[PDB]
Amino acid sequence: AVQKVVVHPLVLLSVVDHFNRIGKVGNQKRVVGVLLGSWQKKVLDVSNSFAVPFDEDDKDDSVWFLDHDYLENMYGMFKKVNARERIVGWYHTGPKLHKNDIAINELMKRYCPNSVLVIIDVKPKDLGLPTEAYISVEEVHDDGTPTSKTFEHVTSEIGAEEAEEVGVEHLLRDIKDTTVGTLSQRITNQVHGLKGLNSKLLDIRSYLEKVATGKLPINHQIIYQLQDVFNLLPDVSLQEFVKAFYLKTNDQMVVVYLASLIRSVVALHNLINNKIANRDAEKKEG
Amino acid sequence: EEKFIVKATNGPRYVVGCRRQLDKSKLKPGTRVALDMTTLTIMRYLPRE
Amino acid sequence: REELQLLQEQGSYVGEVVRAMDKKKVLVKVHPEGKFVVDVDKNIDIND
Amino acid sequence: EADALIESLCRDKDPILRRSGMYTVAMAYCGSGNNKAIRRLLHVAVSDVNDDVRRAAVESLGFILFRTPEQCPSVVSLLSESYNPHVRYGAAMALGICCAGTGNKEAINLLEPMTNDPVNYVRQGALIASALIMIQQTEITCPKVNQFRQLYSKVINDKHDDVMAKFGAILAQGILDAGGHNVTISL
Amino acid sequence: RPANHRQLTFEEIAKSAKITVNEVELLVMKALSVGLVKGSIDEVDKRVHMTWVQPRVLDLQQIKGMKDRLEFWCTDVKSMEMLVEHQAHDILT
Amino acid sequence: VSVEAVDPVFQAKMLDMLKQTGRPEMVVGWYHSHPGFGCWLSGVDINTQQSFEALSERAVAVVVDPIQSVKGKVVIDAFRLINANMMVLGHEPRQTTSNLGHLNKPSIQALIHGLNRHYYSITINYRKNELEQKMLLNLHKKSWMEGLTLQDYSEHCKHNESVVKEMLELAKNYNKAVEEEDKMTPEQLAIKNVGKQDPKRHLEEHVDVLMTSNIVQCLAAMLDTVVFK
Amino acid sequence: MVLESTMVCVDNSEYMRNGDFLPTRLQAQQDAVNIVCHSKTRSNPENNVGLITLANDCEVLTTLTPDTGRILSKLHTVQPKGKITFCTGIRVAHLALKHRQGKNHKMRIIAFVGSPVEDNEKDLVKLAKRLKKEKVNVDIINFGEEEVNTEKLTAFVNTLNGKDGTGSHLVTVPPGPSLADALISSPILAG
Amino acid sequence: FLEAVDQNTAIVGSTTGSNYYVRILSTIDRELLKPNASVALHKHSNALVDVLP
Ligand SMILES: [Zn+2]
């Protein structure tokens, strides 16, 4: 159905507000809010949202608390002031996916249309993309397991419409734009290695552990395709790619010629002025 | 080809861009179009009668 | 960027003074819905 | 002793506390006994975008470099005309405190570009800096007539200037007339 | 064998399937007819090229090889990253 | 916008709904928008302001007008209401005059000293903690980055031999278009040499061209890392 | 007047529709809810009444509100599924008592049980210990029965009920032609 | 465009016929100082980025 979605920073900043108004409780469990957007267009667009109280139980995990009246009131007034946005789905700040979440989402699965689930972290220590869009659909399982709600990963992007970019850029005055050049590119070319390093290290360890040491048949079948992807590159000897390396290095030579020639052109005015201005200043000095 | 010049009925002249929705098929000149007060985008065109 | 606010000023008209007065208030001939009579700036003399 | 403490509080998020680290390390390193502080002082001065630590930067610099009045205007010569006016203000305070009580003309001859600027802050700071020098000085040795006249013009120009401009003006004039030339200041 | 000269010949195939050299063309024709293998051999002289295939059920030696190649790839990427970033952080930042 | 437009029962209702929730804050005032006729306040506006300031002595007034406001600056100016009985004494008896220069951002020569009678403004500052800083910075950096971050890099790396090449050809075309004039330049350098009648710098642009040319060199090591491991 | 919250649990099972006892007594106890909520309305109209079932999946039909107008409309569509649930039925109410508006209102929760308890004595005495710990008023009402009326339920109530003075009361209704209304109106908990 | 009375400054006529006085940006060279040309200012800033034939 939906190929990709658009998530604005405003809702995550509303989560920052959720971490703001806490006021030192001593509980700070997962808080379920109500996300709003436009389900009319194929691509999902998030504008703004509100917050609803959500509480659970220590021992029993099947306990979930929502409000129909508050939801209908907030959505009612929001629809009253703005008719260009309606209900879509919900989201939680919990780093882990609870089993009760299917029952929590079941409500909006009944009353509302199909809802999208978003998982974020309470502490922004994650370098990767904090927002993961998960569509709720029923898929046929190959192993023959009974049909249940399955969360499928949907690609997403973080962007703003018009004024939000200005607001962010003004409030920050730190981050820099694309700015094609040396430092902007080389920073990426440096840190990206760590971007892959910490992620892969955080992944393959728990992967290796849970595969051999673990149970609850999450359908490992896709991981054979994972390993297959890892085997899609059987150590190519580059012998066929030698010509490509030759063309690339030829382009490098072109870069060399361009650089040398252009710099040689720039050196003109400098290696003229450095003489003609100095000799004239010196002779007219006294 | 991406951005062209528009002429208002009142007489001032302006310039607009291209929306990701519409294509370059009806973007060709010789056809009266419509504009928006914000960002000067184009929802659709205005066929003459 | 300090001139940027003077760009936000939405430009400036072209003044034409057909007559000067002894009250030190300069009248200016302008395009229709024009003719705004006001004293000039203090750093610039009127008689000039 | 407190080196580790200052180094630990230098990375703090609070701009006020960031300036507090510089103000703390200011009087501690006075006497020009540490060349390490000025490194991160100038570093946080140029790199950081917030004008708070930038205007709070060279005060500690002048405090530790107060020993030699001559070397200061040379290294603050680049901070004479800066990007943001706050740096020019802090630099004006720097030239004010460093050249205070001395006969150094390196600031004095550079006071002329400083006395006139589109920004009122750097102007006021230039008035203070000009107030902290001419005090206790003979007129026959050096031509202070120019800056004295431009200082005496501040009161008649108050109508055509900013409200805070005349404030810093008469405030700068209250420095020379203080104590009737009898009392002065010494670092 | 995930590595070490993937290139093979029809000899092993004809030896295992006890079939002649004449029927291996129809055999691989049927193999390409099913669609489980994308293998296409560009060879001139006698040769057999292989391609992507599905692990399906399970393999133990391919699990050992999985963790092996993965550990090696990981420590290589890590080594290169640290090596480059070592001077890169100092001379550029 | 009017004092009658505000529904008291609906107001108190929503406020109560905020009270039962985790938002126990009283209303500090009200804000609005004044598009296209200016950010100033009309008669009805100052009247309903007078009516709404009966409770709170402060009554912060904020007017946002993005319509004629350039996207270059989002800077906004908060508004205040002076008393009518203070006309005898001084206008603004406020200390800390050092922030008036920061309040000088509305430097417009009309509305300020034009409407200055019985009217004034107040300074504006922000607040940021480590949580908001790190979160928003990481989110924005990620917004300018990719999901796995290794996706769209190799794409351009392999597009250097297709897309960028044409851009390099065009770059050589413009550079040559400069060079043909650069052939005429040494004559002038052999004639006048006094003063510059040409506003064109001819240098920094070509430098930027070199900066765009360095992409190949920077992505070369990238391709090396991709090929290696 | 008296400031307190009212939580009523209805049985959505098919045991209420049996042909021996009242002909779908669900409507009768519905009318009971009506007359007691109207009684509370006459006494203290500012009290709110929530509604939820005893089934496996806990679903709130109406959030606690002083206006029973839409509640009367939400009394329909009982969705006759599931059998019975106890623990999470308690945890979906007593733990949800903190979501009330007025903080000065006392905590009062009742229940209508038309099905045998599937939980052992352990869970019973534990949950009773919990309710006694957090000190919440609980009124046990059982409509219809299969096995013996009160066996472990007596000790359950005794252990659940603290503060003997003016505390909670136990309501036990036997089989009979009379309705449940005037029968549950007998204690002081009603009216 | 109408005329240039001085260096790096000129006047520009509008569509309504009302002449506007706007100082050009330093980046713009003397090529745009041509007496008769089609010039495009901003709808707000009223600055000329480029001219069209
Ligand atoms: Zn209006």
UniProtKB/Swiss-Prot annotation, chain A:
Modification type N6-acetyllysine: residues: K200, K210
Pfam families reported for this sequence: JAB, MitMem_reg
InterPro entries from the UniProt entry: EIF3F/CSN6-like_C (IPR024969), JAMM/MPN+_dom (IPR000555), MPN (IPR037518), MPN_RPN7_8 (IPR033858)
PROSITE patterns found in the cross-reference section: MPN
Keyword terms of this UniProt record: Acetylation, Isopeptide bond, Proteasome, Ubl conjugation
GO biological process: proteasome-mediated ubiquitin-dependent protein catabolic process
Domain MPN: 5-140
Molecular function GO labels: protein homodimerization activity
UniProt GO cellular component terms: cytosol; extracellular exosome; extracellular region; ficolin-1-rich granule lumen; membrane; nucleoplasm; nucleus; proteasome complex
Record cross-link Glycyl lysine isopeptide (Lys-Gly) (interchain with G-Cter in ubiquitin), residues: K176
Keyword Cell cycle attributed: no
Family statement: Belongs to the peptidase M67A family.
Free-text function comment from the UniProt entry: Component of the 26S proteasome, a multiprotein complex involved in the ATP-dependent degradation of ubiquitinated proteins. This complex plays a key role in the maintenance of protein homeostasis by removing misfolded or damaged proteins, which could impair cellular functions, and by removing proteins whose functions are no longer required. Therefore, the proteasome participates in numerous cellular processes, including cell cycle progression, apoptosis, or DNA damage repair.
Miscellaneous notes: Does not bind a metal ion.
Protein name: 26S proteasome non-ATPase regulatory subunit 7
Organism: Homo sapiens
Swiss-Prot record, chain C:
Domain of life the protein comes from: Eukaryota
Localisation per UniProt entry: Cytoplasm; Nucleus
Role: Component of the 26S proteasome, a multiprotein complex involved in the ATP-dependent degradation of ubiquitinated proteins. This complex plays a key role in the maintenance of protein homeostasis by removing misfolded or damaged proteins, which could impair cellular functions, and by removing proteins whose functions are no longer required. Therefore, the proteasome participates in numerous cellular processes, including cell cycle progression, apoptosis, or DNA damage repair.
Quaternary data: Component of the 19S proteasome regulatory particle complex. The 26S proteasome consists of a 20S core particle (CP) and two 19S regulatory subunits (RP). The regulatory particle is made of a lid composed of 9 subunits, a base containing 6 ATPases including PSMC5 and few additional components. Component of a complex with USP49 and RUVBL1. Interacts with PRPF19. Interacts with TRIM5. Interacts with NDC80. Interacts with PAAF1. Interacts, in vitro, with the thyroid hormone receptor (in a thyroid hormone T3-dependent manner) and with retinoid X receptor (RXR). Interacts with ERCC6.
Family: Belongs to the AAA ATPase family.
Listed name of the protein: 26S proteasome regulatory subunit 8
Gene: PSMC5
Curated annotation (Swiss-Prot), chain E:
Domain of life of the native organism: Eukaryota
N6-acetyllysine carried by residues: K15
Record's subunit section: Component of the 19S proteasome regulatory particle complex. The 26S proteasome consists of a 20S core particle (CP) and two 19S regulatory subunits (RP). The regulatory particle is made of a lid composed of 9 subunits including PSMD13, a base containing 6 ATPases and few additional components.
Family to which the UniProt record says this protein belongs: Belongs to the proteasome subunit S11 family.
Primary role: Component of the 26S proteasome, a multiprotein complex involved in the ATP-dependent degradation of ubiquitinated proteins. This complex plays a key role in the maintenance of protein homeostasis by removing misfolded or damaged proteins, which could impair cellular functions, and by removing proteins whose functions are no longer required. Therefore, the proteasome participates in numerous cellular processes, including cell cycle progression, apoptosis, or DNA damage repair.
Protein name stated in the entry: 26S proteasome non-ATPase regulatory subunit 13
Species: Homo sapiens
Shown residues within the full chain: 284 to 376 of 376
From Swiss-Prot, chain F:
Residue positions of motif JAMM motif: 32-45
Alphabetized UniProt keyword annotations: DNA damage, DNA repair, Hydrolase, Metal-binding, Metalloprotease, Phosphoprotein, Protease, Proteasome, Ubl conjugation pathway, Zinc
Tissue specificity field: Widely expressed. Highest levels in heart and skeletal muscle.
Broad EC category: hydrolase
GO cellular component: cytosol; cytosolic proteasome complex; extracellular region; ficolin-1-rich granule lumen; nucleoplasm; nucleus; proteasome accessory complex; proteasome complex
Residue numbers carrying Phosphothreonine: T185
GO molecular function terms listed in the Swiss-Prot or TrEMBL record: endopeptidase activator activity; K63-linked deubiquitinase activity; metal ion binding; metal-dependent deubiquitinase activity; metallopeptidase activity; proteasome binding
UniProt key word Transcription regulation: no
Keyword rRNA processing: no
GO biological process, one term: protein deubiquitination
Domain MPN: from-to ranges: 1-85
Modified positions (Phosphoserine) in chain numbering: S69, S143
Residues engaged in binding Zn(2+): H32, H34, D45
EC number: 3.4.19.-
Binding partners and assembly: Component of the 19S proteasome regulatory particle complex. The 26S proteasome consists of a 20S core particle (CP) and two 19S regulatory subunits (RP). The regulatory particle is made of a lid composed of 9 subunits including PSMD4, a base containing 6 ATPases and few additional components. Within the complex, PSMD4 interacts with subunit PSMD7 through their respective MPN domain. Interacts with TXNL1.
UniProt record similarity statement: Belongs to the peptidase M67A family. PSMD14 subfamily.
Name of the featured protein: 26S proteasome non-ATPase regulatory subunit 14
Gene name tied to this protein: PSMD14
Residue range from the parent sequence: 82 to 310 of 310
